[PDB]
Structure 1
Amino acid sequence: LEEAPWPPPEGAFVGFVLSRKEPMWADLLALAAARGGRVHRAPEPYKALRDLKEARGLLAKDLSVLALREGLGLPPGDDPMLLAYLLDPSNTTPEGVARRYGGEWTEEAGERAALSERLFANLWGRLEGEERLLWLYREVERPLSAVLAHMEATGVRLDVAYLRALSLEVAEEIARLEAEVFRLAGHPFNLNSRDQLERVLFDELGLPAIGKTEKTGKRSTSAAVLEALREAHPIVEKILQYRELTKLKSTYIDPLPDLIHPRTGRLHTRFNQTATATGRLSSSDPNLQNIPVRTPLGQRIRRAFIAEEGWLLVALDYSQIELRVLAHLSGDENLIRVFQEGRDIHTETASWMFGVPREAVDPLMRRAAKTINFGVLYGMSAHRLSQELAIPYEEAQAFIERYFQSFPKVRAWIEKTLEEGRRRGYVETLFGRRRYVPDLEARVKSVREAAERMAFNMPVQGTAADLMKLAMVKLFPRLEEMGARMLLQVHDELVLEAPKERAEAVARLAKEVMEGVYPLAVPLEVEVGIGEDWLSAK
């Protein structure tokens, strides 16, 4: 390409190099652009950002986030990654997309700009005729990237002092647990080492080995195994408690306070748009889509996520989302009637397994019911179900029988989905998002049946993701007009931040937008709450 002077013409494809993957923390090391057979390299990247009206190219969102960090309104536009991701969700990295569609992903901005131009031309050509995939690109993914950019650049407020004090408290308790484990073992050892713990439990203490690990075939010390051994030795109980606290302390309590950005004073995650096989987003650096919430200590961690002074958090979460999607996709009249009558399958399964009235079901019980309802739906075995439900194997097999017998159209849909996946080689969501599942024709049963479970799950989970994404695209401009912020997304949930005097109005509006994003054969219901912290708003 002919090297031309900065700036480039409007509509050029951008290429950029970051000192680190996180745009909110990265130094913009180089900036370049390409169009019309030319390449423009910026003398000073930061100054050069002011010259762009739109970020078109690979990882456009990341550059837009960095521009927002610097107070620049540089929205993301076309991104070859989103085109490749829609053609095949296994296209998740620029390294692979480049090598697959005509280029090489290097570490030079000028080459990345030229690569973005070449890959867009080729990928856009491959989507000619894919009307449904082009609709998802034009109406969902491309506009969503702008929404995610603003979310990432905004961040969430965290109660640092609260978590600092919590760290010191949990530390003392971990010391009491580790000292108790060492005494029962008769000697000290690295309790974090599952190899050393394996010997203590199964060689020294002589406890029975329940299961083995996948790759190396060692005797597993997983929670499920230890749960089965909860009454075989007092050490097992202390280990489970040690595992819980060290996990929450090492992954959330201690790391998150150190990630507050100096310029914003807030915590900034990344929402990765081409990371999953089903169309879901993912969150990383740090992951804010798996913040603790189940246990009492987990709830205390949620409370650390707070609203800015004078603001309130608004949390909206779809009710029984994939079950409602399943009703629409399958067309089972019985399942449809469940939601038309306002029933809650999670509560009903919870009341059955715990033997208590509906009003006695606590959040912990309901989460346990979710595992069963979705576990059974997506192919859980009676053997595992018997252990999860703590019932005889014969009763567990009966549970799976009544489950599908209650909704006979579900099985018919599963077989229709798998058959089409075998013939076409991919399954699709309600909006046409595809996932290629070639192992549906595999000759090894284990491999084949694994692909099958992945296959007919993707339309359900993927449609829910399509719906959530479309709702985010619709809702974002409405929140801007009301002075509200979109902070976090958790697959079927949104966390917003609104002025105290507008929180009620935002909550009502966001609820309506989410529930009416795309009318289905069943109503989409959203649970909404308002509070100064994430747990309160739930």
Structure 2
Amino acid sequence: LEEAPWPPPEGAFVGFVLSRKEPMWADLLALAAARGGRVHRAPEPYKALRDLKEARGLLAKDLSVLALREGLGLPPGDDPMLLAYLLDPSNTTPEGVARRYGGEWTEEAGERAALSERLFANLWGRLEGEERLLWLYREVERPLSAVLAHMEATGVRLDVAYLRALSLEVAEEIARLEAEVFRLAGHPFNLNSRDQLERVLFDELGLPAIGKTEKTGKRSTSAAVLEALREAHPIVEKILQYRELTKLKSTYIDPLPDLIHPRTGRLHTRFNQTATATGRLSSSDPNLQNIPVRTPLGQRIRRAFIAEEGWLLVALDYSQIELRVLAHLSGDENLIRVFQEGRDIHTETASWMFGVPREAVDPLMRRAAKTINFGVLYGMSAHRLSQELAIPYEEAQAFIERYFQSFPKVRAWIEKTLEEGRRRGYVETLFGRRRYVPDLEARVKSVREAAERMAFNMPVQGTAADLMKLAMVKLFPRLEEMGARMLLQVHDELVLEAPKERAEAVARLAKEVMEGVYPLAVPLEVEVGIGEDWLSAKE
């Protein structure tokens, strides 16, 4: 490409190099643009940012986030990563997409700009005739990248002093647990080392091994194994408690306070748009889609996520979302009827689990039923179900039989999905998002059946993802108009931040936008709460 002076003409593709992968923390080291067989290299990257009308190119969102950080309203536009990811969601990295579709991902901005241009041309041609993928790109993914950029640049407020205080308390409890474990073992060891623990449990204390690890065949010390050994030796419960506390401390309590951005005073995640096989987003650096909530200490951690003073958090979560999606995809009359009648399958399974009438099912019971319902749907064994519930194998087998007998078109939908997947090589969501699953044709049963479970999960999980993404795209401009902010997405949940006086109106509007995103054979229902912290906003 012929070198031409900065600035480039409009519509040019950008290339940029960051000192580190996270745009909220990166120094913009270089910036370039490419168009019309010219490459324009910026003498001074930061000032040159002010010349662009939009970020168009590989990882466009990341440059947009950095621009927003610097107070520039630079929206992301076309991005070849999004085209590639829609063609095949195994296309997750610029390194791989470049190799597959026409170049090499290097560490120079000019080359990245020229690459973005070249890859866009080739990938755009590959989507020709692919109207459903094209619709996903234009109506969902491309606009969503703009929304995600704003979310990343906005961040979420964290009560740092609270977490610092919590760390000191948890450390003291961890010490009590570890000391008791060493007392019971007869000697100290590194309790964080599963290899050392294996030797203590199975060689020294002579507890029965229960399961093996996947890749190396060691005797497993997983929580499931420890659960089954809970009554074999007093050390086991102590280990389980130690595991819970150290997991929460090392992953959330300690690292999060150190990630507050100096300028914004907030915590900023990255919403990765081309990272999953199903069409879900992911979140990283830090992952804010896995903040604890299911246990008491976990709930204490979630309380650290708070609204700006004078504002409130609004949390909205789709009800029974993958079951509703399954009703639509499978067309099962019974499943459809459940939702037309306003019933709750989580509550119903909890009723059976705890042997109480539906009226007596408390929120804790209902929530315990969730992993059971989705586990069973997506192929969990009777052995596992019986172990997890401490019921006879025969009763677990019966539950699984009844579950599918209750919704007889579900198995029919699964079989149709797998047959079509074997023939075409891919399965698809309601909107036509694809996932290639070649191992449906594997000659090894273990491999093939694992591939089958992946394959029939994808249309359900992926359709739910498509719906949430479309809802985000519809909702964002409404929030801007009301002076509210979109902060986080957690798969079927959004967390927003609204001025106190407007929080009620924002809640109502967001609920309606999400429920009406795309009418199905069953209604979509959204649960919405408002509060000063993330825990209180989900009730």
TM-score interval, normalised by the smaller of the two chains: over 0.9
SS at match of 1:529: strand
Cα distance per residue 1:64-119 (max 9 Å; x no partner): 00000000000000000000000000000000000000100000000000000000
| 1:498-529 Cα shifts (integer Å, max 9, x gaps) | 00000000000000000000000000000000
Q: CA RMSD in A?
A: 0.7
Rounded Cα–Cα distance in structure 2 between residues aligned with 1:356 and 1:15: 61
1:355-375 Cα distance to aligned partner (Å, 9 max, x none): 224354344432321111111
Give 4+ residue runs of structure 1 displaced > 4 Å after superposition. Answer: none
Secondary structure of the corresponding residue to residue 271 of structure 1: strand
- Pair 169,281 (structure 1): closer, same or farther in 2 beyond 3 Å: same
Once residues 334 and 353 of structure 2 are traced to their aligned partners in structure 1, the CA distance between those partners, rounded to angstroms, is: 22
Query: Which position in structure 2 is the counterpart of 1:439?
Result: 439
1-structure distance, mates of 2:262, 2:491? 29
Tell me the distance in 2 between the aligned counterparts of 1:163 and 1:348.
37
SS in 1 for 2:315: strand
Distance 1:423 1:478 in 2: 43
Aligned partner of 1:142 in structure 2 is 142
| C-alpha distance in 1 between matches for 2:215 and 2:439 | 20
Contact 1:39 1:110 in 2 (8 A): yes
- Provide, for residues 410-445 of structure 1, a one-character-per-residue CA deviation record: whole Å limited to 9, x for no partner: 011001100110110000000000000001111000
Deviation for aligned residue 1:350: 1.0
Contact 1:314/1:507 (<8 A) preserved = yes
Q: For residues 223 and 287 of structure 1, what CA distance do their matches in structure 2 show?
A: 22
CA distance in 2, matches of 1:449, 1:181: 40
**Deviation for aligned residue 1:409:** 0.5
Deviates more, 1:343-352 or 1:162-171: 343-352
Tell me the SS of whatever aligns to 2:379: coil
Deviation at 1:277, TM superposition (A): 0.1
Query: Helix, strand or coil: the match of 2:519?
Result: coil
How far did 1:352 drift? 1.1
Deviates more, 1:386-395 or 1:3-12: 386-395
Separation of aligned partners in 2, 1:297 and 1:492: 23
Using the alignment, how far apart are the partners of 2:360 and 2:164 within structure 1?
Answer: 35
SS of residue matched to 1:498: strand
Whole-angstrom CA distance in 1 between matches of 2:261 and 2:238 = 37
Indicate the larger mover: 499-508 or 350-359: 350-359
**1:191 paired residue number:** 191
Aligned equivalents of 2:179 and 2:397: distance in 1? Answer: 43
3-state SS in 2 of match to 1:479: helix
Render the CA deviation track for 1:447-471: whole Å, top value 9, x for unaligned. 0000000001000000000000000
Distance across 1 between alignment mates of 2:496 and 2:347: 27
Deviation of the 1:314 alpha carbon: 0.2
Give the conservation status (yes or no) of the 8 Å contact 1:102–1:118: yes
Cα distance per residue 1:310-368 (max 9 Å; x no partner): 00000000000000000000000000000011111001111210122435434443232
- The correspondence of residues 99-498 of structure 1 with structure 2, limited to 5 A, is 99-498=99-498
CA deviation profile, 1:358-408 (whole Å, cap 9, x unmatched): 354344432321111111111111111111121111111111110000011
Structure-2 separation of matches of 1:97 and 1:401: 44
Contact 1:294-1:364 within 8 A present in 2 as well: no
Rounded Cα–Cα distance in structure 2 between residues aligned with 1:390 and 1:511 = 39
Does the aligned pair in 2 maintain the 1:16–1:113 contact within 8 Å? yes
User: Distance in 2 between the 1:237 and 1:159 partners?
Assistant: 32
Q: Find the aligned partners of 2:458 and 2:91 in 1 and give their Cα distance.
A: 16
Alignment partners' CA distance in 1, 2:262 and 2:363? 36
In 2, the alpha carbon distance for the partners of 1:120 and 1:202 equals 57
CA contact 1:479–1:506 (8 Å) conserved in 2: yes
Out of 375-384 and 126-135, give the one that drifted further. Answer: 375-384
Contact 1:60-1:77 within 8 A present in 2 as well: yes
Give, in whole Å, the separation in 2 of the partners of 1:88 and 1:369: 34
SS of structure 2 residue aligned to 1:172: helix
Q: Distance in 2 between matches of 1:236 and 1:500?
A: 48
Aligned to 1:93: 93
The share of aligned pairs that are identical, in percent, is: 100
Tell me: CA distance 1:65–1:368, structure 2 relative to 1, closer, same or farther (3 Å).
Answer: same
The residue matched to 1:150 in structure 2 has which SS? helix
179-188 vs 360-369, which deviates more? 360-369
For residues 358 and 265 of structure 1, the distance between their equivalents in structure 2, rounded to whole angstroms, comes to: 45
Preserved contact between residue 278 and residue 458 of structure 1 (Cα < 8 Å)? yes
Q: Secondary structure of the equivalent of 2:214?
A: coil
User: Partners of 2:356 and 2:496 in 1: how far apart?
Assistant: 35
124-133 vs 344-353, greater mean Cα deviation = 344-353
Matching of residue 7 in structure 1 with residue 7 in structure 2: yes
* Distance across 2 between alignment mates of 1:224 and 1:402: 26
SS of residue in 2 equivalent to 1:337: helix
Question: For the residues of structure 2 that align with 1:389 and 1:224, how far apart are their CA atoms?
Answer: 12
- CA distance in structure 1 between the aligned counterparts of 2:525 and 2:50, rounded to whole angstroms: 43
**Number of aligned residues:** 538
Q: Secondary structure at the match of 1:92?
A: coil
Counterpart-to-counterpart distance in 2, 1:442 and 1:390: 35
Per-residue deviation, 1:266 = 0.4
- The two structures have a TM-score, normalised by structure 2, of 0.99
**What stretches of structure 1 of length at least 5 have no aligned partner?**
none
Q: How does 1:39-58 map to 2 (within 5 A)?
A: 39-58=39-58
Change over 3 Å in CA distance of 1:29–1:374 after alignment to 2: same
Alpha-carbon distance in structure 1 between the residues aligned to 2:9 and 2:66: 21
Q: Which moved more, 1:37-46 or 1:353-362?
A: 353-362
Tell me how far apart the structure 2 counterparts of residues 344 and 513 of structure 1 sit (CA, whole Å).
22
**1:269-304 superposed Cα distances (whole Å, 9 cap, x missing partner):** 000000000000000000000100011111111110
Using the alignment, how far apart are the partners of 1:493 and 1:268 within structure 2? 18
Per the normalisation by structure 1, the TM-score is 0.99
CA shift, 1:246, in A, is: 0.3
1:399, 1:152 → 2: CA distance? 43
Q: Determine the C-alpha separation between the residues in 2 that align with 1:62 and 1:357.
A: 51
- Indicate if the aligned counterparts of 1:14 and 1:34 stay in contact, CA closer than 8 A: yes
Give per-residue Cα distances to partners, 1:30-60, cap 9 Å, x unaligned. Answer: 0000000000000010000000000000000
CA contact (8 A) 1:440 1:451 kept: yes
Deviations 1:94-145 (A, max 9, x none): 0000000010000000000000000000000000000000000000000000
More divergent stretch after superposition (239-248 vs 344-353): 344-353
> Does the 8 A contact of 1:33 with 1:39 survive in 2?
yes
